Amino acid sequence: MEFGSFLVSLGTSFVIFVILMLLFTWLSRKSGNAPIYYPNRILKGLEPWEGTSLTRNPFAWMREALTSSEQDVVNLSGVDTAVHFVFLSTVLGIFACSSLLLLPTLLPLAATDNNIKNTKTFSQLDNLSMANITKKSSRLWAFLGAVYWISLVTYFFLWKAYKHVSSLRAQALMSADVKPEQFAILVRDMPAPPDGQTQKEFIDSYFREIYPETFYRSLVATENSKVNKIWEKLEGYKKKLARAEAILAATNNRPTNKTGFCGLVGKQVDSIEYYTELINESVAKLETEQKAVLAEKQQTAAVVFFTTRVAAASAAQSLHCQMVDKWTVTEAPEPRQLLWQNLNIKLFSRIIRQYFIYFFVAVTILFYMIPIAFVSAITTLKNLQRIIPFIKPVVEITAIRTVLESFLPQIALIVFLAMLPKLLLFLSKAEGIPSQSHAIRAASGKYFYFSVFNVFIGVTLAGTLFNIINLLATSLPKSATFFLTYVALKFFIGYGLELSRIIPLIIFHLKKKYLCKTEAEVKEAWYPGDLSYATRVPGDMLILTITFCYSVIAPLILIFGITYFGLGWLVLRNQALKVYVPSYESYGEMWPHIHQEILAALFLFQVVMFGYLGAKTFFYTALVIPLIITSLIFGYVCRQKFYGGFEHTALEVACRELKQSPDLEEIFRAYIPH
Amino acid sequence: MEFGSFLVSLGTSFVIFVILMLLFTWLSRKSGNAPIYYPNRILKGLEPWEGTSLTRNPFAWMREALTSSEQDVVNLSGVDTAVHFVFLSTVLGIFACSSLLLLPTLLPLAATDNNIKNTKTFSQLDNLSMANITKKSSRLWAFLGAVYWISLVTYFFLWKAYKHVSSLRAQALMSADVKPEQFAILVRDMPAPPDGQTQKEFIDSYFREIYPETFYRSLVATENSKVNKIWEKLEGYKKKLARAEAILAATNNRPTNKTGFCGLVGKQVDSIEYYTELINESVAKLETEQKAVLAEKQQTAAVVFFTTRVAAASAAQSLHCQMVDKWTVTEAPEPRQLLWQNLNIKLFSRIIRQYFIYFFVAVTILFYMIPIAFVSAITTLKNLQRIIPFIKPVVEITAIRTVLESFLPQIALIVFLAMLPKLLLFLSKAEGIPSQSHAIRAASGKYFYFSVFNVFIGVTLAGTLFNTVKDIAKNPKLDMIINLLATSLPKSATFFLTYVALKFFIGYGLELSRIIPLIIFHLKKKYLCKTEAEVKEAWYPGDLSYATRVPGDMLILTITFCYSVIAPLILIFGITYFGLGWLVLRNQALKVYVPSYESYGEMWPHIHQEILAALFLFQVVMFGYLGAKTFFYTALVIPLIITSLIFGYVCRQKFYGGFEHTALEVACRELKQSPDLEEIFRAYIPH
């Protein structure tokens, strides 16, 4: 019955994906939906291209995507998205070459043997797996050569893509213009000022010693939580007064508000004047607090500004005081990336929080594994049928009952998986990470480990429970069925939902028609947001992890991986061409993390291949040990070969970049939060 | 080992030690011995002993040693020897506290138990060890408490020591004079000029852009291997001609050289005229070659000199080109430390050589595992008797087997572990290491791997098998474990007692008495050698030789952590080893040895990493043992291992970053005094 289960799930996913595709064709063909299907190119208003109206058969939206050079993507969005695209491209290339060799040689090899049905059918695809292969068979040699070739191919593609990303980084850095993050460093962990002088007088006359005639200013970090809170309160008050003024300018007859707190407690009489007195009182209070904070709440973190890229880039890898405890220095993140909150955290606090968060993550795997499986089994009562509701017995088809009992576990799992990334991002920022990009990358790494351990081990154990030498052997083929479902579920809808973009489109065209969106305020009406690498990269790493897991056992997941990453390349190329706009520009710094994962997945599932063929019990599984040690060798040689360039900007892309006498004053007041 | 061999080895070591001490204290009172027992304070003339006719002979030097502060050693020998001394002192403190708690509360527990008689031979040393503890005994709880306490004590002393060494390094760097290694970097792994243009024209006009008005000159590392050969040969000719003319002046008889048979017995040629014509020809050839190679024989390594310490120190941690394959930059070593041949090794070549050397190190790990098995076979000759009865005729009388047991295995171990360090230092120098200090510390690390694996594992396991392999006729899985483990481990513990005793007694007697370099002296003078004064190179003492001292010391440290619990008689031997080492090496450093390089304490983090590696590995050993003793302490040592890893990471994160570089305070606020910057140059010239 499992055969029918994933057959039906695949059919439903394909059908609904087709539905959303047709909707996309229907919706995007209208000019009224341009802001939701072309948020980009409206900002920096490149006039979203329509040309002729319709012919409806050819040339819909493909020529725009497939004819986009990496230079075009970098110019239009940035060099960061092109890194994600080269990640997708190298994964696609690995899987394409792997399929082109594996499948024509392993499909017939698996077809001929009949070990399954001899150890005494469940499903036909079970014949096309490394389970219909007899014990002590010569086909073990072909299988081992296959995994060996997989390792060789992925090594080659990783090296090529990593050279390419290093070249793209060196190209983007060298041609950049004057940016405020090129003249600053982020000094943390300073001692208390000696006797009476405040922190500002201490930071100065210290850097003014080390760096005479090449030091400009210092923006000491101050606890401003009160200043923040009152500031967004005042900004929201100004926004409300502005929308009220626009309403007045429209109707010229001040309407009546729903008098009260959320329309419950109060008298809204000429609310314009209420908000006016509120905002001016808030301005006075904010002025007083802003004056107060700059003199008393002066903490132990400070951005430091130099006068030349040479000095700033050189005074960011150097060690300033002969104790790693004090005056720790790193390159200042760009203003859009500084987390003023997570500064001020001393080194010991950073270490202790790092290990407490990692331990809490491990406890998260544990309290996921046992308790959430327990409560999911509890939800099975709601899943099948409940006596208490008086639902009319009209359904009467068991097939969709099976569909529901397949979805509900997956639905709950996905709900908690979507609860994850916010929690992991919040935890990542709790180690005191001083930049948004590093926080997002650490969250992605934590989610990757969680996903691998959790999903892989849990589904493997579930397969073992369903069905010691045959323990690792027989169990894995059945687990492929579950992944064939879940991969497929995330396969169609997620790419379908993003491409169709109906979920933002449902929110749009309704926030405008209803009481919301009185004034134009179109910018935040349809602001797209980032690519949110907190959810793209770890999900694609999970798909890659599964594909390299069953890369050899059941070489039918390879075609699913290829089609997944091909559709991802296509849809995300279209999106980055027309939809998203980045909020931070990390110049491809992300990608070494992706390289380390990819290699970690390859290492882990070379180990899995070793163990699984050891379950096949032939004295040649030791041949995997050279592959494991080779993965270690490749990791170290890559680390020393490229990783240096991805942490800093070398003193050529900073020195001879030919600045044009920067004012150094608009570089300042660019890190000012106020 | 049985009682006779252990006792006779201890007695022989003690008697030779006291003989050497008596010889030293008697023979140090002779003025002629000054440049032997006081090489230092003769160089840098200081009137070695102040006064007349030093009394208190056994303490004439001991009193002069216990009253010397770390500041005195730093001012007299250097800031590197003081690091070795804090290493010795902290190991001594760890083992002192460990003894003060372990011994009184652990030894009686082993003494009162009677796991012995389970044999259905040994020593009383085995009775005062783990083997005497029965199965599932409450005393193993005390033993677990003991290992937990020793781990805590080591953590405490390591942290305190590492703060102290960081303080010493800061105090030394902050007050050092104008030394040429502070203004320079070692620019290595360059590309080639893609035109008609010499390499030096390319190193310039490139750094002149990155560091304008703060870039002074740049030596390109010209390959001079054959130039070096001709220069050393010329200097040998100079020395030999000086010897000949000194002989002629001292005897007024025309010297005659019979060149042939390695220049000893051959064709008779007139000495000084031959040497003069040959030396002038050699000078002409040398200067022609130097002119021909200082230009146009360029390669892809260089040394760069800035003008201010701030720029020089800042532009050494930085990254120069946006590809780490090009313009690799590291802080320049001292001119005395640079290995000019190891430059001109591109990054891939360096990695390939590193990996080949590591693999060869593993192969020779096995090839030394073999004679370690031989040693562990020899040490238990009685059990070796029942196997291979070919040794029955030779092992008949008490005395012969006694002397073999007492001497031979220790001598074999010494021979192997003393031939090894030269090989390891040569191997490390082939990894493209660009300095002498890094090569020495890498050789020390490889020696630590050899020590741990071969010595510890091989000796203990070979003794285990050869004490049990012939008694595994029956195969009860539960039963063979206990017999194997208990009847095995304390035997290796006793052998290591003997070995460590041999080391501290004989080695420190030889070092303190210094007779071997003294027999070379007083004989290289009275015989044909040492005709001219030339005293300086006749008794030049040399370094502390950290390539051979720290390795052996860490081997003894690992052994003491071996049987700090299993057989807590090792603890006394380790304490006395390190105490005698402290005392003797103090006397040496204050008076005898003078270093050739100054690393400003960069070597101690490696020492800390080893020490913690030993602690980790033998928390693991205790975990395996208590758990092969059949009780559930298994979960009581995993927390110790986890906290060991956390301690390692925390120490690396808090202090290690301060050892690799000199901060930009000791560089700026060092208050320069108008450095010449020209005599700073031509101090890195290879000649």
Short mmCIF file of all heavy atoms in Angstrom, two decimals, chain A residues 95 98-111 125-133 142-144 146-147 150 477 480 484 546-562 609 612:
data_model
loop_
_atom_site.label_atom_id
_atom_site.label_comp_id
_atom_site.label_asym_id
_atom_site.label_seq_id
_atom_site.Cartn_x
_atom_site.Cartn_y
_atom_site.Cartn_z
N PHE A 95 25.15 16.26 -9.66
CA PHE A 95 24.10 15.27 -9.80
C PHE A 95 23.90 14.85 -11.26
O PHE A 95 23.59 13.69 -11.53
CB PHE A 95 22.80 15.79 -9.21
CG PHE A 95 22.82 15.89 -7.71
CD1 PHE A 95 21.82 16.54 -7.03
CD2 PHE A 95 23.85 15.31 -6.99
CE1 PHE A 95 21.84 16.63 -5.65
CE2 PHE A 95 23.88 15.40 -5.61
CZ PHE A 95 22.88 16.06 -4.95
N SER A 98 26.77 12.48 -12.13
CA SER A 98 26.54 11.27 -11.36
C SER A 98 25.44 10.43 -11.99
O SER A 98 25.59 9.21 -12.13
CB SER A 98 26.16 11.64 -9.93
OG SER A 98 24.92 12.31 -9.89
N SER A 99 24.33 11.05 -12.38
CA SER A 99 23.26 10.29 -13.02
C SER A 99 23.73 9.71 -14.34
O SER A 99 23.55 8.51 -14.60
CB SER A 99 22.04 11.18 -13.23
OG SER A 99 22.28 12.12 -14.27
N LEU A 100 24.39 10.53 -15.16
CA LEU A 100 24.78 10.12 -16.50
C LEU A 100 25.68 8.90 -16.47
O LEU A 100 25.71 8.11 -17.42
CB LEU A 100 25.46 11.28 -17.22
CG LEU A 100 24.58 12.10 -18.17
CD1 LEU A 100 25.34 13.30 -18.71
CD2 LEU A 100 24.06 11.23 -19.30
N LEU A 101 26.44 8.73 -15.39
CA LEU A 101 27.22 7.50 -15.28
C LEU A 101 26.48 6.39 -14.53
O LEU A 101 26.33 5.28 -15.05
CB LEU A 101 28.59 7.78 -14.65
CG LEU A 101 29.69 8.20 -15.63
CD1 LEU A 101 29.99 7.05 -16.59
CD2 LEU A 101 29.33 9.45 -16.43
N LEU A 102 26.01 6.67 -13.31
CA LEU A 102 25.31 5.68 -12.50
C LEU A 102 24.13 5.01 -13.19
O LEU A 102 24.14 3.79 -13.40
CB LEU A 102 24.85 6.33 -11.19
CG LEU A 102 25.80 6.56 -10.01
CD1 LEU A 102 26.16 5.21 -9.49
CD2 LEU A 102 27.07 7.31 -10.37
N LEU A 103 23.10 5.78 -13.56
CA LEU A 103 21.83 5.16 -13.94
C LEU A 103 21.95 4.20 -15.12
O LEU A 103 21.44 3.07 -15.01
CB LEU A 103 20.77 6.23 -14.18
CG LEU A 103 20.11 6.86 -12.95
CD1 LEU A 103 21.04 7.78 -12.20
CD2 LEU A 103 18.84 7.60 -13.35
N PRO A 104 22.59 4.55 -16.24
CA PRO A 104 22.67 3.58 -17.35
C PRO A 104 23.40 2.30 -17.00
O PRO A 104 23.24 1.31 -17.71
CB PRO A 104 23.41 4.37 -18.44
CG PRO A 104 23.15 5.79 -18.13
CD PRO A 104 23.13 5.86 -16.63
N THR A 105 24.20 2.29 -15.93
CA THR A 105 24.93 1.11 -15.53
C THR A 105 24.38 0.42 -14.29
O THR A 105 24.63 -0.77 -14.10
CB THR A 105 26.41 1.45 -15.28
OG1 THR A 105 26.51 2.40 -14.21
CG2 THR A 105 27.03 2.04 -16.53
N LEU A 106 23.64 1.14 -13.44
CA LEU A 106 23.10 0.57 -12.21
C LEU A 106 21.63 0.19 -12.32
O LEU A 106 21.18 -0.72 -11.62
CB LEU A 106 23.29 1.54 -11.04
CG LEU A 106 24.60 1.35 -10.26
CD1 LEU A 106 25.79 1.83 -11.07
CD2 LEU A 106 24.52 2.06 -8.92
N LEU A 107 20.86 0.88 -13.17
CA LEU A 107 19.49 0.44 -13.42
C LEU A 107 19.43 -0.99 -13.97
O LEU A 107 18.72 -1.82 -13.37
CB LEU A 107 18.79 1.43 -14.36
CG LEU A 107 17.30 1.21 -14.62
CD1 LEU A 107 16.50 1.46 -13.36
CD2 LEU A 107 16.81 2.09 -15.76
N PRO A 108 20.14 -1.35 -15.04
CA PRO A 108 20.07 -2.74 -15.50
C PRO A 108 20.72 -3.71 -14.53
O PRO A 108 20.26 -4.85 -14.39
CB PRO A 108 20.79 -2.71 -16.85
CG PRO A 108 21.77 -1.61 -16.71
CD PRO A 108 21.11 -0.57 -15.84
N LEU A 109 21.80 -3.29 -13.87
CA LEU A 109 22.45 -4.15 -12.89
C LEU A 109 21.51 -4.51 -11.76
O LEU A 109 21.45 -5.67 -11.32
CB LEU A 109 23.72 -3.48 -12.37
CG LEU A 109 24.67 -4.27 -11.46
CD1 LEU A 109 26.08 -3.75 -11.62
CD2 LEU A 109 24.24 -4.15 -10.01
N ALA A 110 20.76 -3.53 -11.26
CA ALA A 110 19.77 -3.81 -10.23
C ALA A 110 18.61 -4.63 -10.79
O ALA A 110 18.03 -5.46 -10.08
CB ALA A 110 19.26 -2.51 -9.61
N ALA A 111 18.26 -4.40 -12.06
CA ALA A 111 17.14 -5.12 -12.65
C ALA A 111 17.41 -6.62 -12.74
O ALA A 111 16.53 -7.43 -12.43
CB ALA A 111 16.82 -4.55 -14.03
N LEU A 125 9.78 -0.36 -7.29
CA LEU A 125 10.99 0.42 -7.07
C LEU A 125 11.94 -0.25 -6.08
O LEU A 125 13.15 -0.01 -6.15
CB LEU A 125 10.62 1.83 -6.59
CG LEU A 125 9.84 2.06 -5.29
CD1 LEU A 125 10.72 2.05 -4.05
CD2 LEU A 125 9.09 3.38 -5.40
N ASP A 126 11.42 -1.08 -5.18
CA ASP A 126 12.29 -1.84 -4.29
C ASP A 126 13.22 -2.78 -5.04
O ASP A 126 14.32 -3.07 -4.55
CB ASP A 126 11.45 -2.63 -3.28
CG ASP A 126 10.59 -1.74 -2.41
OD1 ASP A 126 10.96 -0.57 -2.19
OD2 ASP A 126 9.53 -2.22 -1.94
N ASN A 127 12.82 -3.27 -6.22
CA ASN A 127 13.74 -4.01 -7.07
C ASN A 127 14.89 -3.13 -7.55
O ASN A 127 16.01 -3.62 -7.73
CB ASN A 127 12.99 -4.60 -8.26
CG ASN A 127 11.87 -5.54 -7.85
OD1 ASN A 127 11.52 -5.63 -6.68
ND2 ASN A 127 11.28 -6.22 -8.83
N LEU A 128 14.63 -1.85 -7.77
CA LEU A 128 15.64 -0.92 -8.27
C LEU A 128 16.33 -0.20 -7.10
O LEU A 128 16.29 1.02 -6.96
CB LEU A 128 15.00 0.08 -9.23
CG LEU A 128 14.33 -0.56 -10.45
CD1 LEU A 128 13.62 0.50 -11.28
CD2 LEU A 128 15.33 -1.33 -11.28
N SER A 129 16.97 -1.00 -6.26
CA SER A 129 17.67 -0.50 -5.09
C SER A 129 18.78 -1.48 -4.74
O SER A 129 18.83 -2.60 -5.27
CB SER A 129 16.71 -0.29 -3.92
OG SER A 129 16.04 -1.50 -3.59
N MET A 130 19.68 -1.07 -3.85
CA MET A 130 20.78 -1.93 -3.46
C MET A 130 20.32 -2.90 -2.36
O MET A 130 20.88 -3.03 -1.28
CB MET A 130 21.97 -1.08 -3.02
CG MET A 130 23.16 -1.80 -2.41
SD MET A 130 24.58 -0.69 -2.36
CE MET A 130 24.41 0.06 -3.97
N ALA A 131 19.20 -3.55 -2.65
CA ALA A 131 18.66 -4.61 -1.82
C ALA A 131 18.33 -5.87 -2.60
O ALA A 131 18.39 -6.96 -2.03
CB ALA A 131 17.39 -4.14 -1.09
N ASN A 132 18.00 -5.75 -3.88
CA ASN A 132 17.86 -6.88 -4.78
C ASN A 132 19.21 -7.46 -5.18
O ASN A 132 19.26 -8.31 -6.07
CB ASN A 132 17.08 -6.47 -6.03
CG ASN A 132 16.17 -7.57 -6.53
OD1 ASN A 132 16.01 -8.60 -5.87
ND2 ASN A 132 15.57 -7.36 -7.69
N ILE A 133 20.29 -7.01 -4.55
CA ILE A 133 21.64 -7.47 -4.87
C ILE A 133 22.02 -8.58 -3.89
O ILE A 133 21.93 -8.40 -2.67
CB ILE A 133 22.64 -6.31 -4.81
CG1 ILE A 133 22.23 -5.22 -5.81
CG2 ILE A 133 24.04 -6.81 -5.10
CD1 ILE A 133 22.20 -5.68 -7.24
N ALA A 142 31.10 -2.97 -8.80
CA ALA A 142 30.56 -1.85 -9.57
C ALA A 142 30.01 -0.78 -8.64
O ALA A 142 30.18 0.42 -8.89
CB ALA A 142 29.49 -2.34 -10.54
N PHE A 143 29.34 -1.19 -7.57
CA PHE A 143 28.78 -0.23 -6.62
C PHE A 143 29.88 0.59 -5.94
O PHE A 143 29.75 1.81 -5.78
CB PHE A 143 27.95 -0.99 -5.60
CG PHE A 143 26.59 -1.39 -6.11
CD1 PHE A 143 25.89 -2.42 -5.51
CD2 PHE A 143 26.06 -0.79 -7.23
CE1 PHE A 143 24.66 -2.80 -5.99
CE2 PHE A 143 24.82 -1.16 -7.71
CZ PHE A 143 24.12 -2.17 -7.09
N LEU A 144 30.95 -0.08 -5.52
CA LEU A 144 32.06 0.62 -4.87
C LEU A 144 32.74 1.58 -5.84
O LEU A 144 33.07 2.71 -5.48
CB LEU A 144 33.06 -0.38 -4.31
CG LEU A 144 34.09 0.20 -3.34
CD1 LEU A 144 33.41 0.71 -2.09
CD2 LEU A 144 35.14 -0.84 -3.00
N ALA A 146 31.25 2.99 -8.24
CA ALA A 146 30.29 4.07 -8.42
C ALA A 146 30.43 5.13 -7.33
O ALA A 146 30.47 6.33 -7.63
CB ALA A 146 28.88 3.48 -8.43
N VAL A 147 30.48 4.71 -6.07
CA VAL A 147 30.63 5.69 -5.00
C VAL A 147 31.99 6.38 -5.08
O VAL A 147 32.12 7.58 -4.79
CB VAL A 147 30.39 5.06 -3.61
CG1 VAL A 147 31.48 4.07 -3.25
CG2 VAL A 147 30.28 6.13 -2.55
N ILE A 150 31.59 9.01 -7.60
CA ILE A 150 30.82 10.09 -7.00
C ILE A 150 31.75 11.02 -6.24
O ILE A 150 31.69 12.25 -6.38
CB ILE A 150 29.73 9.54 -6.08
CG1 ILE A 150 28.65 8.83 -6.88
CG2 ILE A 150 29.11 10.65 -5.26
CD1 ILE A 150 27.85 9.75 -7.70
N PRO A 477 16.25 0.96 2.33
CA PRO A 477 15.35 1.05 1.16
C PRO A 477 13.95 1.53 1.49
O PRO A 477 13.36 2.31 0.73
CB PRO A 477 15.32 -0.39 0.64
CG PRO A 477 16.64 -0.95 1.00
CD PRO A 477 17.12 -0.23 2.24
N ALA A 480 13.61 5.23 2.02
CA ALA A 480 13.61 6.01 0.79
C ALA A 480 12.19 6.39 0.39
O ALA A 480 11.97 7.45 -0.21
CB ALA A 480 14.29 5.22 -0.33
N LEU A 484 11.04 10.00 -0.47
CA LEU A 484 10.43 10.20 -1.78
C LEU A 484 9.13 10.99 -1.66
O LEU A 484 8.74 11.71 -2.58
CB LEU A 484 10.20 8.85 -2.46
CG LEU A 484 9.73 8.78 -3.92
CD1 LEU A 484 10.22 7.49 -4.55
CD2 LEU A 484 8.22 8.87 -4.02
N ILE A 546 20.09 14.19 1.78
CA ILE A 546 19.32 12.99 1.45
C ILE A 546 19.81 12.38 0.14
O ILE A 546 19.97 11.16 0.02
CB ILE A 546 17.82 13.30 1.42
CG1 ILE A 546 17.33 13.68 2.81
CG2 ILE A 546 17.04 12.12 0.88
CD1 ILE A 546 17.75 12.70 3.88
N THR A 547 20.04 13.23 -0.87
CA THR A 547 20.45 12.73 -2.17
C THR A 547 21.79 12.01 -2.10
O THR A 547 21.96 10.95 -2.69
CB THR A 547 20.51 13.87 -3.18
OG1 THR A 547 19.22 14.47 -3.29
CG2 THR A 547 20.92 13.33 -4.54
N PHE A 548 22.75 12.57 -1.36
CA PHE A 548 24.03 11.90 -1.19
C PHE A 548 23.92 10.71 -0.25
O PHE A 548 24.76 9.80 -0.32
CB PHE A 548 25.09 12.87 -0.69
CG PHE A 548 25.87 13.53 -1.80
CD1 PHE A 548 25.63 14.85 -2.13
CD2 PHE A 548 26.82 12.83 -2.50
CE1 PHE A 548 26.33 15.46 -3.14
CE2 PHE A 548 27.53 13.44 -3.52
CZ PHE A 548 27.28 14.76 -3.83
N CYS A 549 22.93 10.69 0.63
CA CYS A 549 22.66 9.53 1.46
C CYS A 549 22.32 8.33 0.59
O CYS A 549 23.04 7.33 0.59
CB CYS A 549 21.52 9.80 2.43
SG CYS A 549 21.17 8.42 3.54
N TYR A 550 21.22 8.43 -0.15
CA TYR A 550 20.77 7.33 -1.00
C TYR A 550 21.33 7.46 -2.41
O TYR A 550 20.75 6.96 -3.38
CB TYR A 550 19.25 7.25 -1.01
CG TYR A 550 18.67 7.10 0.38
CD1 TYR A 550 18.13 8.18 1.05
CD2 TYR A 550 18.68 5.87 1.02
CE1 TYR A 550 17.61 8.04 2.32
CE2 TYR A 550 18.16 5.72 2.29
CZ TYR A 550 17.63 6.81 2.93
OH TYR A 550 17.10 6.68 4.20
N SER A 551 22.48 8.11 -2.53
CA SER A 551 23.12 8.30 -3.83
C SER A 551 23.44 6.98 -4.50
O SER A 551 23.37 6.89 -5.73
CB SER A 551 24.39 9.13 -3.67
OG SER A 551 25.34 8.44 -2.87
N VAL A 552 23.80 5.97 -3.73
CA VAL A 552 24.24 4.70 -4.27
C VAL A 552 23.24 3.58 -3.99
O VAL A 552 23.03 2.71 -4.84
CB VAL A 552 25.64 4.35 -3.72
CG1 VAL A 552 26.15 3.06 -4.33
CG2 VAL A 552 26.61 5.48 -3.98
N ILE A 553 22.59 3.61 -2.82
CA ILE A 553 21.68 2.53 -2.46
C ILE A 553 20.54 2.43 -3.46
O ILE A 553 20.24 1.35 -3.99
CB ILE A 553 21.13 2.73 -1.03
CG1 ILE A 553 22.24 2.66 0.02
CG2 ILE A 553 20.06 1.70 -0.72
CD1 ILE A 553 22.78 4.01 0.39
N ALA A 554 19.87 3.54 -3.73
CA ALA A 554 18.70 3.58 -4.59
C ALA A 554 18.90 4.68 -5.62
O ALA A 554 18.35 5.78 -5.50
CB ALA A 554 17.42 3.81 -3.78
N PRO A 555 19.67 4.41 -6.67
CA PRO A 555 19.97 5.46 -7.65
C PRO A 555 18.76 5.83 -8.49
O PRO A 555 18.84 5.92 -9.72
CB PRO A 555 21.08 4.85 -8.50
CG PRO A 555 21.67 3.78 -7.64
CD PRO A 555 20.50 3.22 -6.90
N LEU A 556 17.63 6.04 -7.82
CA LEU A 556 16.49 6.73 -8.38
C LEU A 556 16.22 8.05 -7.68
O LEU A 556 15.42 8.85 -8.18
CB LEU A 556 15.24 5.85 -8.31
CG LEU A 556 14.86 5.18 -9.63
CD1 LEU A 556 13.54 4.44 -9.50
CD2 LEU A 556 14.79 6.21 -10.75
N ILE A 557 16.87 8.30 -6.54
CA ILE A 557 16.81 9.60 -5.89
C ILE A 557 17.66 10.61 -6.64
O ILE A 557 17.46 11.82 -6.49
CB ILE A 557 17.24 9.49 -4.42
CG1 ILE A 557 16.95 10.78 -3.66
CG2 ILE A 557 18.72 9.17 -4.33
CD1 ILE A 557 15.51 11.23 -3.78
N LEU A 558 18.61 10.15 -7.46
CA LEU A 558 19.45 11.07 -8.21
C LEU A 558 18.64 11.89 -9.19
O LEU A 558 18.87 13.09 -9.35
CB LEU A 558 20.56 10.31 -8.93
CG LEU A 558 21.87 10.09 -8.18
CD1 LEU A 558 22.56 11.42 -7.93
CD2 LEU A 558 21.65 9.36 -6.87
N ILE A 559 17.68 11.26 -9.88
CA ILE A 559 16.85 12.00 -10.82
C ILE A 559 15.98 13.01 -10.08
O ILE A 559 15.75 14.12 -10.56
CB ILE A 559 16.02 11.03 -11.68
CG1 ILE A 559 15.46 11.76 -12.90
CG2 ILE A 559 14.90 10.39 -10.89
CD1 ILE A 559 16.51 12.21 -13.88
N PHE A 560 15.53 12.65 -8.88
CA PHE A 560 14.74 13.58 -8.08
C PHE A 560 15.59 14.76 -7.64
O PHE A 560 15.12 15.91 -7.65
CB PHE A 560 14.12 12.87 -6.88
CG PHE A 560 12.94 12.01 -7.23
CD1 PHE A 560 12.52 11.01 -6.38
CD2 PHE A 560 12.24 12.23 -8.41
CE1 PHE A 560 11.42 10.22 -6.70
CE2 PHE A 560 11.15 11.45 -8.73
CZ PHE A 560 10.74 10.44 -7.88
N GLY A 561 16.84 14.51 -7.25
CA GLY A 561 17.72 15.61 -6.90
C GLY A 561 18.01 16.52 -8.08
O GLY A 561 18.01 17.75 -7.95
N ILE A 562 18.25 15.93 -9.26
CA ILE A 562 18.51 16.74 -10.44
C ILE A 562 17.31 17.61 -10.77
O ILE A 562 17.45 18.81 -11.03
CB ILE A 562 18.88 15.86 -11.65
CG1 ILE A 562 20.18 15.11 -11.38
CG2 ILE A 562 19.00 16.70 -12.90
CD1 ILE A 562 20.44 14.06 -12.40
N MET A 609 28.17 4.73 3.28
CA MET A 609 28.44 3.72 2.26
C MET A 609 29.37 2.64 2.79
O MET A 609 29.16 1.45 2.54
CB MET A 609 29.05 4.38 1.02
CG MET A 609 28.93 3.57 -0.27
SD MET A 609 27.34 2.81 -0.68
CE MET A 609 26.17 4.06 -0.15
N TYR A 612 27.35 0.44 5.21
CA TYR A 612 26.30 -0.31 4.54
C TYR A 612 26.88 -1.43 3.67
O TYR A 612 26.32 -2.53 3.64
CB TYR A 612 25.44 0.64 3.71
CG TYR A 612 24.41 -0.05 2.86
CD1 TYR A 612 23.13 -0.29 3.35
CD2 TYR A 612 24.69 -0.44 1.56
CE1 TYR A 612 22.18 -0.91 2.58
CE2 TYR A 612 23.75 -1.07 0.79
CZ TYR A 612 22.49 -1.30 1.30
OH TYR A 612 21.55 -1.92 0.51
#
